[PDB]
């Protein structure tokens, strides 16, 4: 079982103690475009999360924000920027064994939970209780939460604001004073009446009436903080005139310690909003989370990319990060803390710093890194140039090489293929895929999103299609900025994907108007001719993507799992396989392919674990490429065991290579790929010497 539940049950009805000793407010997501806006509350007995957006779980897992202790997750709006990425959050709790997690927010949450059951399956093992704003006030061992529903002038006009209030904490009991007064201390002579003096109750002792508050330090009245989101201009007026808010701002006996503002820049500059912010009083600190906050969230991703950038700048591009107001405010920053008890202050000690210079130095001081990099650089840069000068396109950007859940280094599977400078397609869209796109391009993300022609989904696993909605809303915003007309996107995915989107469309938020979905069944070789509406969509896919052929097959994976194979008018063929075991159907379709992207989830010796998990090992994946006769093989979808680098089997030839996050590969780089291994081993020498010990331990343990 879990430790925290036992401690709670030990306290009984919150007895033997008052409120939590320390309660601070930490920012997990500053509100940037890539990371979204999120807020984390810490307390001795409870922990709360607000606006669980896309990729929030990855940030908490990266910054030592424990997940197995969360109690409630509060959502200010039912919008993918706020509810998106929540599905993966629930699974993480289930893996940790959390018995129950309470969700609060708009009354559309209950429908969303059943929407995610289409692909996520049954959420057995973890109790999901939705607490809509219509539900009574929630009381905890730490604080009370007031859910305020705001309606702009399913339901897309609803925004939920939370007015939290810490419970009063009993003051310290001065033992020395009580004894001098004549109150015996020790054994049973203190146990009964110590609580009375601690609970603020008058106590009679030997005919003497003593007030509890006199002999104890002034109890904390309980600081209150507010989390409010203003998506756009249409929400300012309802917020300003809300009756409940007035009860906490103009009054003097109900001060507000902090007010989180998850609103854009344009909303804040509004005159009406400015007056409302000032109405809280000068003693109320204001925190703002929006796109104006320039900060680094995935520090590890930046660190590893900079170290890898030394080997090859082009193959390992560096990541690029994407007004006076009357009321002062503090711009949100990652890991920024605001203590609420026992002291009200800004704790900026935990803020991370992103200085590349340390990362380059750390890589160079390694034993054999610099020598290997220097050796490779002279052999390649000053070496003979290839006779055939291949074009700069297509270029494959490996935005993610994760298996099940995002981590510090590897994100869930997602690959971007740039067919030409003005067209591209996404081979997979996992959770946080847009964040990788935004980080990889920064200001150029909108341009890249404008060239997105089609999106392919291998199957319904959460690690392959949970990020599609984020692309749609962001693509809509990107298209508007360029002024191009808004047209539905072409999505190739199994038929059952419609149910999850249809359920979300009819209950949570309209998203299908951005989708022109092509079922993956009619794209297979020798497939039945579908309705003319689908057929014209098929013709659009080939024309828009400038592809001679777009093939599909059924791979050895869960039911309704499909592969891919791209054929270009030039002649080059790119074959992508999702989660699959070694399959013969894939080999036939992708024969004589130029580039092969094959799963390499598990290592050698895990063959039995592969069949139960329905995946392929490193050697199995490579053998498939040779059987398919591919000019080059790329391995991705690695298991989270090999966070940095997978085990290098002896079968690794010049026609194979591993994939990394934010890694750019072109057909002209194939001769360079084999020469990048020795530098990689030196860089990942520590991780390399730790992975095979588990293998050595594995063999002995199974032998036992």
């Amino acid at each position: 079982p879990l430790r925290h539940l036992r401690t709670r049950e030990k306290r009984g009805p919150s007895g033997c103690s008052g409120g939590p000793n320390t309660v601070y407010l930490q920012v997990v997501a500053a509100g940037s475009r890539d990371s979204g806006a999120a807020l984390y509350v810490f307390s001795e007995f409870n922990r709360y999360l607000f606006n669980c957006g896309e990729g929030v779980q990855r940030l908490m897992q990266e910054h030592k924000l424990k997940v197995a202790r969360l109690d409630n997750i509060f959502l200010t709006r039912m919008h993918w920027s706020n509810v998106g990425g929540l599905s993966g959050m629930i699974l993480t709790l289930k893996e940790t064994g959390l018995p129950k997690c309470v969700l609060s927010g708009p009354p559309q949450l209950e429908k969303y939970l059943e929407a995610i059951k289409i692909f996520s399956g049954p959420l057995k093992g973890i109790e999901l209780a939705v607490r809509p704003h219509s539900a009574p006030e929630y009381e905890d061992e730490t604080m009370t939460v007031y859910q305020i529903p705001i309606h702009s002038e399913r339901d897309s006009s609803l925004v939920v604001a939370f007015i939290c209030k810490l419970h009063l904490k009993r003051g310290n009991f001065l033992v020395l004073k009580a004894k001098e007064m004549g109150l015996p201390v020790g054994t049973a002579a203190i146990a009964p009446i110590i609580a009375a003096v601690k609970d603020g109750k008058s106590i009679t002792h030997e005919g003497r009436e003593i007030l509890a508050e006199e002999l104890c330090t002034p109890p904390d009245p309980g600081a209150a903080f507010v989390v409010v989101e203003c998506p756009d201009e249409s929400f300012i007026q309802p917020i300003c005139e809300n009756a409940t808010f007035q009860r906490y701002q103009g009054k003097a006996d109900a001060p507000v310690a902090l007010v989180v503002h998850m609103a854009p820049a344009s909303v804040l500059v509004d005159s009406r909003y400015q007056q409302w912010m000032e109405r809280f009083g000068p003693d109320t600190q204001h925190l703002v989370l929006n796109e104006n906050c320039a900060s680094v969230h995935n520090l590890r991703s930046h660190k590893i990319q900079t170290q890898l950038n030394l080997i090859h700048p082009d193959i390992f591009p560096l990541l690029t990060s994407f007004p006076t107001l009357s009321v002062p405010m503090v711009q949100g920053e990652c890991l920024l803390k605001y203590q609420l008890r026992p002291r009200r202050e800004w704790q900026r000690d935990a803020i991370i710093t992103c200085n590349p210079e340390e990362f380059i130095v750390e890589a160079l001081q390694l034993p054999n890194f610099q020598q290997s990099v220097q050796e490779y650089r002279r052999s390649a840069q000053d070496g003979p140039a290839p006779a055939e000068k291949r074009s700069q396109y297509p270029e494959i950007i490996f935005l993610g090489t994760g298996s099940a859940i995002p981590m510090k280094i590897r994100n869930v599977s997602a690959t971007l293929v740039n067919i030409s400078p003005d067209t591209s397609l996404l081979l997979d869209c996992g959770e946080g895929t847009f964040g990788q796109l935004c980080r990889h391009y920064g200001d150029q993300v909108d341009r890249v999103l404008g060239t997105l022609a089609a999106v392919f989904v291998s199957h319904l696993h959460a690690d392959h299609h949970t990020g599609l909605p984020s692309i749609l809303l962001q693509r809509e915003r990107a298209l508007a900025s360029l002024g191009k007309p808004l047209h539905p996107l072409l999505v190739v995915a199994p038929n059952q994907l419609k149910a999850w989107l249809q359920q979300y469309h009819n209950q949570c938020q309209e998203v299908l108007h951005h989708i022109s979905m092509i079922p993956a069944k009619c794209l297979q070789e020798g497939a039945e001719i579908s309705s003319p509406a689908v057929e014209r969509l098929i013709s659009s896919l080939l024309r828009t993507c400038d592809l001679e052929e777009f093939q599909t097959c059924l791979v050895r994976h869960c039911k309704h799992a499909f592969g891919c194979a791209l054929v270009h008018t030039s002649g080059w063929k790119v074959v992508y396989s999702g989660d699959t075991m070694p399959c013969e159907a894939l080999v036939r379709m992708g024969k004589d392919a130029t580039l092969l992207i094959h799963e390499a989830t598990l290592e050698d010796g895990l063959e039995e674990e592969a069949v139960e998990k329905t995946h392929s090992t490193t050697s199995q994946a490579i053998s498939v490429g040779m059987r398919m006769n591919a000019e080059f093989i790329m391995l991705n979808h690695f298991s989270q065991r090999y966070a940095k680098v997978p085990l290098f089997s002896p079968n690794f030839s010049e026609k194979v290579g591993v994939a990394f996050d934010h890694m750019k590969v072109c057909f002209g780089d194939f001769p360079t790929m084999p020469k990048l291994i020795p530098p990689l081993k030196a860089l990942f020498a520590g991780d390399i010497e730790e992975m095979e010990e588990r293998r050595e331990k594995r063999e002995l343990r199974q032998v036992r």
């Binding site: 033992v175 020395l176 004894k179 201390v185 020790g186 002995l700 036992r704």
Partner: protein, 284 residues
């Protein structure tokens, strides 16, 4: 001093503070920079008295029982002078050990990485480690290297041995082990050594770091064994034992006992018996 009343009030609070405390213990509490350190140190003193008083109550009971029983209540070959005889017999073996026994080295260069709590424990295991060597059939030639005369370890050893310190049959010196034996015949045992020891070689000198790291400090001995070009080795715990719980750094008394069994032709089955049973779920 302000610290004296600092304790007395804590007594009124019932902070598990002992009744009688010497001034020597007070300055040790003074060094504690944190309240929790004072809280932890005081608890150690409290349990120290609790065991002693419980010891004493159970001790006077032994005297009372024995005298009562006495009130109610041949040919021999040897006099009952055995305890003296064994001490002399071990001494003769010990003297032979320092002329022909295999050198076993205890490195005392870790005094800078030890607190007072762990420095005291190191001496306790050193006393037991040397005790098992004396009783062994073929004792090692124990070497105490890098043992500064004025260091805390040397001073603590003197108090625990009193006059016996100068009569112990072991070599204690301030020179490093590299200065006493060839560098090619020295193996610095350590759990972090990448090399696993399979056979106990009788022509090699094994170095055991007299270091008790309650606060874990991995690689401390490995760095010492790497600053000087000395080979390192680790016990084959994972090879033979199904490790499940605890840390792989065994105590000094267990370490010498393991080596002693190996040096007496014992195999890994017998040698690894001394590893705590709570650490491993069986042998294979």
């Amino acid at each position: 001093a302000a610290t004296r009343e600092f304790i007395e009030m804590w007594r009124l609070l019932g902070r598990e503070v002992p009744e009688h405390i010497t001034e020597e213990e007070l300055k040790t509490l003074m060094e504690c920079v944190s309240n929790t350190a004072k809280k932890k140190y005081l608890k150690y003193l409290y349990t120290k008295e609790k065991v002693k008083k419980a010891r004493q109550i159970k001790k006077e009971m032994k005297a009372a029982a024995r005298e009562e029983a006495k009130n109610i209540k041949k040919n021999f070959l040897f006099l009952r002078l055995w305890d003296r005889n064994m001490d002399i017999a071990m001494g003769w073996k010990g003297a032979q050990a320092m002329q022909f026994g295999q050198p076993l080295v205890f490195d005392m260069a870790y005094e800078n990485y030890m607190k007072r709590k762990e420095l005291q424990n190191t001496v306790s295991q050193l006393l037991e480690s040397e005790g098992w060597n004396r009783r062994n059939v073929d004792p090692f030639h124990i070497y105490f290297c890098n043992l500064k005369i004025d260091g805390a370890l040397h001073r603590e050893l003197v108090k625990r041995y009193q006059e016996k310190w100068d009569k112990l049959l072991l070599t204690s010196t301030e020179k490093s082990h590299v200065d006493l034996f060839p560098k090619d015949s020295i193996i610095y045992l350590t759990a972090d050594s990448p090399n696993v020891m399979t056979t106990f070689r009788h022509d090699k000198v094994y170095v055991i770091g007299s270091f008790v790291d309650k606060s874990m400090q991995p690689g401390t001995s490995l760095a010492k064994a790497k600053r000087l070009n000395l080979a390192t080795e680790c016990l084959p715990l994972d090879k033979y034992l199904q490790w499940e719980i605890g840390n792989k750094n065994l105590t000094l008394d267990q370490m010498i006992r393991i080596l002693l069994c190996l040096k007496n032709n014992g195999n890994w089955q017998e040698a690894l018996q001394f590893v705590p049973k709570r650490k491993h779920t069986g042998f294979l």
